[PDB]
Design a protein around this ligand. Structure first.
Ligand SMILES: Nc1nc2c(ncn2[C@@H]2O[C@H](COP(=O)(O)OP(=O)(O)OP(=O)(O)O)[C@@H](O)[C@H]2O)c(=O)[nH]1
Ligand SMILES: [Hg+2]
Ligand SMILES: [Hg+2]
Ligand SMILES: [Hg+2]
Ligand SMILES: [Hg+2]
Ligand SMILES: [Hg+2]
Ligand SMILES: [Hg+2]
Ligand SMILES: [Hg+2]
Ligand SMILES: [Hg+2]
Ligand SMILES: [Hg+2]
Ligand SMILES: [Hg+2]
Ligand SMILES: [Hg+2]
Ligand SMILES: [Hg+2]
Ligand SMILES: [Hg+2]
Ligand SMILES: [Mg+2]
Lengths: 166, 304
């Protein structure tokens, strides 16, 4: 295989951890998921690729930790809780600081528009609007609506990401 | 010079008619995500979650102030009554024994669970049980606004801006003899780090230590409509002051230093800074046009 570093970031409660569950074999996956504490390095297989998955907390307190992992990242997964219209700008700000950082190379970013199932969930296109994703023109990016409970979209997303890494 | 804020969300067509004492954030549903609580002039109590209005509930009288103490207990004052509610539903209808009208109300930390504090037009300040009138303190004048600093166990201060343009202090139950005579009338009263900020009708904010020393003075171009503390915890650790002016602008002073300016299309009648949704540093403002505007402060934003 080939080993790659995948940073998973996003505001707290976007479903980074839950989405990361659906990447494990179905017997491995757990039922409820605890709010990530600090951060958790994990590992995941997908074809010719081995993903070392750094799952961060998105709580206020912990966002200052993401930068510890930019230097090594070979790709980034960015989770957005589609039903949290409120914090989109905060989501955006953190995203922007990430892109700014001198350590974060122009590696591919995959945005999951997560919780696609929720009643007030925002359309992928409105999300890409708030985040100003269309402005990103030096990296491959893609936005994929997703349900992290069911697993919907997740593979479609990871599959996309895998193309870029090959 | 610029605005430090992030623009979160704006609802021009919210129907909100409230001033600062009737606006609040709490964790009612215990689920971490905080909710906006408004006692509208509708005599209706409106509840907001995220960008949308969650619930609406009828109130008997038109409200003067709402507080929330200790899990949570929304307390609505009106006339001489104070209706404690629990789990959105009504729970009690306390009435102060007159000789009465409630003017202002706020809370005090029990130790390090809080306890309701009430101003009455009579000229009395009452501190109550965690549910009955426990303390009755006499001050000469009709209270215009009050602020509480400290804990009632270790030690506490109650600052009173009177309609007589005077500044009153109460340290641990006793009314001090130290009375400050200010020029114009009271307009807002915000407790800061080392002192309290009074704003007068003549467009000026003064900062006063309990001793009566005047730390600084802020001179403002238009009229003060609302004042509010902005407490940023963490590394930045400042207790700023927000003033909103009738010319539409909203300002953040870090002590004497103006740190941000932005202007709302409409004059702000109510300002709240605290937790709302899953974000710690959120500025919620209600305009005279009834609109709701939410801004929230970047992680990296310094206030010097
Ligand atoms: N309705 C719905 N709920 C979801 C979805 N994905 C996750 N959740 C739930 O929403 C919450 C999100 O949990 P997490 O996955 O831990 O959030 P997080 O991205 O890890 O953020 P942290 O707090 O930093 O761990 C939990 O209740 C999840 O089980 C989704 O796609 N739809
Ligand atoms: Hg609360
Ligand atoms: Hg509360
Ligand atoms: Hg009111
Ligand atoms: Hg009010
Ligand atoms: Hg209060
Ligand atoms: Hg008052
Ligand atoms: Hg107390
Ligand atoms: Hg008490
Ligand atoms: Hg008491
Ligand atoms: Hg009490
Ligand atoms: Hg005054
Ligand atoms: Hg004054
Ligand atoms: Hg910055
Ligand atoms: Mg997580």
């Amino acid at each position: 295989s080939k080993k790659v570093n995948v940073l998973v970031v996003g505001l707290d409660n976007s479903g980074k951890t839950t989405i990361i569950e659906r990447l494990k074999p179905r017997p491995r996956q757990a039922a409820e998921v605890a709010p990530t504490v600090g951060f958790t390095v994990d590992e995941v297989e997908k074809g010719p690729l081995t993903f070392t998955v750094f799952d961060m907390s998105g709580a206020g307190r912990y966002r200052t930790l993401w930068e510890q992992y930019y230097r090594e990242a070979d790709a980034v997964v960015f989770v957005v809780d589609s039903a949290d219209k409120l914090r989109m700008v905060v989501a955006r700000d953190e995203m922007e600081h990430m892109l700014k950082h001198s350590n974060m190379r122009k590696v591919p970013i995959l945005y999951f528009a997560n919780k696609k199932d929720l009643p007030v969930a925002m359309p992928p296109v409105e999300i890409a609007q708030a985040l100003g994703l269309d402005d990103i023109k030096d990296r491959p990016w893609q936005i994929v609506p997703s349900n992290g409970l069911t697993g919907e979209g997740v593979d479609k997303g990871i599959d996309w990401l895998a193309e870029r890494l090959s | 010079v610029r605005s430090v804020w992030l623009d979160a969300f704006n609802d021009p067509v919210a129907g909100i008619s409230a001033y600062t004492p009737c606006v609040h954030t709490c964790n009612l549903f215990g689920d971490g995500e905080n909710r906006l609580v408004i006692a509208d002039e509708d005599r209706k109590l409106k509840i907001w979650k995220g960008t949308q209005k969650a619930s609406e509930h009828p109130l008997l009288d038109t409200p003067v102030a709402i507080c929330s103490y200790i899990l949570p207990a929304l307390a609505v004052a009106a006339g001489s009554h104070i209706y404690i509610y629990r789990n959105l539903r009504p729970y009690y209808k306390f009435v102060l024994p007159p000789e009465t009208v409630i003017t202002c109300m706020d809370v005090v930390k029990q130790a390090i669970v809080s306890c309701l504090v009430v101003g009455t037009e009579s000229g009395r300040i009452l501190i109550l049980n965690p549910a009955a009138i426990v303390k009755n303190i006499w001050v000469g004048i009709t209270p215009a606004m009050i602020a509480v600093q400290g804990e009632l166990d270790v030690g506490y201060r109650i600052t009173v801006a009177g309609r007589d343009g005077k500044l009153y202090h109460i340290r641990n139950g006793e009314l001090s003899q130290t009375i400050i005579q200010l020029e114009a009338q009271p307009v807002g009263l915000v407790r800061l780090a080392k002192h309290v900020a009074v704003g007068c009708m003549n467009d000026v904010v003064h900062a006063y230590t309990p001793t009566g020393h005047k730390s600084w003075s802020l001179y403002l171009p238009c009229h003060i409509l609302a004042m509010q503390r902005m407490e940023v915890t963490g590394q930045r650790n400042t207790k700023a002051l927000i003033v909103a002016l009738s010319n539409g602008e909203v300002r953040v002073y870090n002590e004497k230093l103006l740190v941000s300016v932005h202007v709302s299309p409409n004059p702000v009648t109510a300002l709240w800074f605290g937790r709302y949704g899953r974000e710690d540093n959120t500025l919620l403002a209600i305009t005279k046009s009834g609109a709701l505007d939410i801004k929230m402060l970047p992680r990296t934003a310094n206030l010097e």
